[PDB]
């Protein structure tokens, strides 16, 4: 459950450390955002030399939420980090190639098959 | 709303509510019958009748219980020595409610609450 003006975590080797969402996507007035979702974010913090840079504006996918997501048995999988993974603005696919930390089955798709392939642990 | 709830506020906060029913039960058991309001009547049903049910076992632990409830050894005495063995067979219903009309100075609906085995 991520709204805008929320700091997140960069869960890969894309180069950034601290980002913040500026736009929930996928429909007008969509208030909050969960996993498997595409959001337009800034970059507040990147490494001294990386693939990305401070202040860059691009899309990302959310992979870990503090609030957690549910399963059809009723079970919920909560994390301790509102953490996300960058994407391309246009080809809509990630930048880094080393996923940091575990992910969910709600990420897997034909869309993010690449990422879960690079994932260290899939819940 | 107050759906499926319980308890009565009595226009008092809980520290007043708790310290009152301490002195209300301590007064009652001392005389087995007092005069009070019908609202204060029906809730003291839910106070002393478990204390009577507590009086059906005199453990020295339960000697500590009622003094923790009341801070009055005399009532702790009187429950266990007398009221315990008195009401020792009754499956609840240790009291009786006598709505006795209205109070003079304010039109308040008074009641008499007594014990069953009082005579």
């Amino acid at each position: 459950m991520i709204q805008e003006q929320t700091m997140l975590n960069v869960a890969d080797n894309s180069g950034a450390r601290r980002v913040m969402c500026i736009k929930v996507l996928g429909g007008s007035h969509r208030r909050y955002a969960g996993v498997g979702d595409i959001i337009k974010i800034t970059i507040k913090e990147a490494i001294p030399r990386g693939k990305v840079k401070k202040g860059d504006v691009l899309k990302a996918v959310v992979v870990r939420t503090k609030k957690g997501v549910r399963r059809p048995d009723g079970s919920v999988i909560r994390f301790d980090g509102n953490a996300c993974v960058l994407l391309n603005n246009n080809s809509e696919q990630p930048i880094g190639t080393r996923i940091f930390g575990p992910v969910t089955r709600e990420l897997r798709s034909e869309k993010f098959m690449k990422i879960i392939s690079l994932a260290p642990e899939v819940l | 709303m107050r759906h499926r709830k319980s308890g009565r506020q009595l226009n008092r906060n809980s520290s007043h509510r708790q310290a009152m029913f301490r002195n209300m039960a301590g007064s009652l058991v001392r005389h087995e019958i007092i005069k009070t309001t019908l609202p204060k009547a029906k809730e003291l049903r839910r106070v002393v009748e478990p204390l009577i049910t507590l009086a059906k076992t005199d453990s020295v632990a339960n000697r500590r219980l009622a003094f923790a409830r009341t801070r009055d050894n005399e009532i702790v005495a009187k429950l266990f020595n007398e009221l315990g063995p008195r009401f020792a067979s009754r499956a609840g219903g240790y009291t009786r409610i006598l709505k006795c009309g209205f109070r003079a100075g304010d039109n308040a609906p008074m009641a008499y609450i007594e014990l069953v085995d009082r005579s």
């Binding site: 399963r71 059809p72 048995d73 009723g74 | 709303m1 759906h3």
Partner: protein, 209 residues
């Protein structure tokens, strides 16, 4: 097609074999006993008046039981009437089991909602509160403006204002039937039916086909 009489036994969840927790609501459907069959000749409309259950015999009245006695059937806990669909006939003394719903998939639960008392407008009509700070005096949950300056200079019919919310006839539609326990006269349906536990309910089939 006719509906049947239920009662909100309570909400629960059914696990499937496959790890899917379906929240259903337990509703019992007793022997729904037909009482009066309204017609075209006397009444102009085909409808069966039914009952189910029973009540205290010292509480049923002489006008009431004589209606049952004319039917020659046990006094229920209440009377209900369903408009008969055509080609669907019944006798007077017939009772009806839950097994009519053995073939449905979606049904409609008709029930009196819970009673929420005198609701506030923000609660009743999903309004916005005003600011709780930045200078607001005494207007933290008021609805603010209600009309206009003088040219339609009144308040209009059907204005969203405060009042009783709930305690009334609502009907959630298209609810999936899950299990028809004809053995102990029960019914499992996915969803959250109106009203509180033990309130009586009306289960018709789905109105949207």
């Amino acid at each position: 097609m006719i509906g049947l009489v239920g009662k909100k036994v309570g909400m629960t969840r059914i696990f499937t074999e496959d790890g899917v927790s379906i929240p259903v609501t337990v509703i019992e459907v007793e022997a729904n006993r037909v009482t009066q069959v309204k017609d075209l000749a006397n009444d102009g409309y085909r409808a069966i008046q039914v009952t189910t259950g029973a009540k205290k015999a010292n509480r049923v009245t002489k006008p009431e039981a004589g209606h049952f006695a004319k039917a020659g059937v046990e006094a229920g806990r209440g009377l209900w009437e369903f408009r008969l669909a055509e080609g669907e006939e019944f006798t007077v003394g017939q009772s009806i089991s839950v097994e009519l719903f053995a073939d449905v998939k979606k049904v409609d639960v008709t029930g009196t909602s819970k009673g929420k008392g005198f609701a506030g407008t923000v609660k009743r009509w999903n309004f916005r509160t005003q600011d709780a700070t930045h200078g607001n005096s005494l207007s933290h949950r008021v609805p603010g403006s209600i009309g206009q300056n003088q040219t339609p200079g009144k308040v209009f019919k059907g204005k969203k204002m405060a009042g009783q919310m709930g305690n009334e006839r609502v009907t959630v539609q298209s609810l999936d039937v899950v299990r028809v326990d004809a053995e102990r006269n029960l019914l499992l349906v996915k969803g959250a039916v109106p009203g509180a536990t033990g309130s009586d309910l009306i289960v018709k089939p789905a109105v949207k086909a």
